[PDB]
Design goal:
The structure is a homodimer. The first copy, chain A, is an alpha/beta fold. Chain A has a single domain, classed as Roll (2,3-Dihydroxybiphenyl 1,2-Dioxygenase, domain 1), CATH 3.10.180. Chain A has helices at residues 15-25, 74-86, 119-128; strands spanning 5-12, 29-34, 37-42, 45-51, 67-71, 91-93, 101-105, 111-115, 135-136. In chain A, the strands form two sheets. Chain A has a four-stranded mixed β-sheet, with helices on one face. The longest helix of chain A has 13 residues, at 74-86. Chain A is globular. The two termini of chain A are 20 Å apart. Strand 1 (5-12) of chain A pairs antiparallel with strand 5 of chain B. The structure holds ethyl 5-(trifluoromethyl)-1H-pyrazole-4-carboxylate (2 copies) and manganese (II) ion (2 copies). One ethyl 5-(trifluoromethyl)-1H-pyrazole-4-carboxylate (T9Y) is lined by residues 33-34 of chain A. Residues 67, 69, 113 of chain B line the site of one manganese (II) ion (MN). Chains A, B: Its EC number is 2.5.1.18.
Chain lengths: 137, 137
């Protein structure tokens, strides 16, 4: 069967600023780069940045809710979010509808998130403050 | 410091067919559903389906290369690809890279992939045959 995400590939319009964002600003590990892409890791996540002439820099009001959340500890969350804010990283959402999260944009408008907590923790929180019509299996 | 992918959220235009696709066709575990979304798991992956009227059913020629690859063993790959083919799931690309890959579309046109092989396997292959302009770190 399927077991886990093998990799996440993000199309990027300009490779160098995107590599810098994920490696320098977000602290991911850069393993390789080439004329048309880069491979990074974030813990056990394999991230590929793929230079794509079709990628457009997309304002958040023009894209749907598809988004990518990265895990961060409760101890590190607030200072990392504040550092992104002070660095001028654009945002896309403010209301915490799914727990402790910070919503921010990459250089091409990919919708990213810092989140504290696992799926198990989110299900437990939802039992007390469920979403409308929620059923648990 | 970021420790991995916390969750992947896909915006969907119709919740019921998307739940059917990810749970029944792709075999992911459904943990909860509410009027506007669902939580599933696939190995370590936390997947959220979020009902979003802004989601367009998007032909693959009209979206960029951003895509989501799921892990499967080599031994299971061919029968899973055949299951998708029997279900009429469209393919958006042929494999031309190392490691088995099957490139398929979800009901809204999200670009998915089945892939066999890790980042370490890819890096080893690239060291032997580097892409144009490739540098390692
Ligand atoms: C850590 C300094 O970097 C930034 O503030 C920033 C903001 N957007 N991209 C960056 C980058 F690429 F330099 F990492
Ligand atoms: C793709 C090889 O280039 C690199 O790894 C790299 C890293 N900083 N700058 C480069 C450059 F200029 F070659 F694009
Ligand atoms: Mn989220
Ligand atoms: Mn891929």
């Amino acid at each position: 069967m399927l077991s886990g995400l093998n990799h996440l590939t993000l199309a990027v319009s300009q490779l160098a600023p995107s590599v810098a964002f994920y490696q320098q600003l977000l602290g991911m590990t850069l393993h390789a780069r080439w004329d048309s892409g880069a491979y990074l890791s974030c813990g056990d996540l394999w991230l590929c940045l793929s230079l794509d002439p079709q990628r457009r820099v997309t304002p958040p009001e023009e894209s749907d809710y598809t988004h990518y959340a990265f895990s961060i500890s409760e101890a590190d969350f607030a200072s990392f979010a504040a550092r992104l804010e002070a660095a001028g990283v654009a945002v896309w959402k403010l209301n915490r509808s799914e727990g402790a999260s910070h919503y921010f944009l990459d250089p091409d408008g990919h919708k990213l998130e810092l989140h504290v907590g696992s799926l198990a923790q989110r299900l437990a929180a939802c039992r007390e403050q469920p979403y409308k019509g929620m059923v648990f299996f």
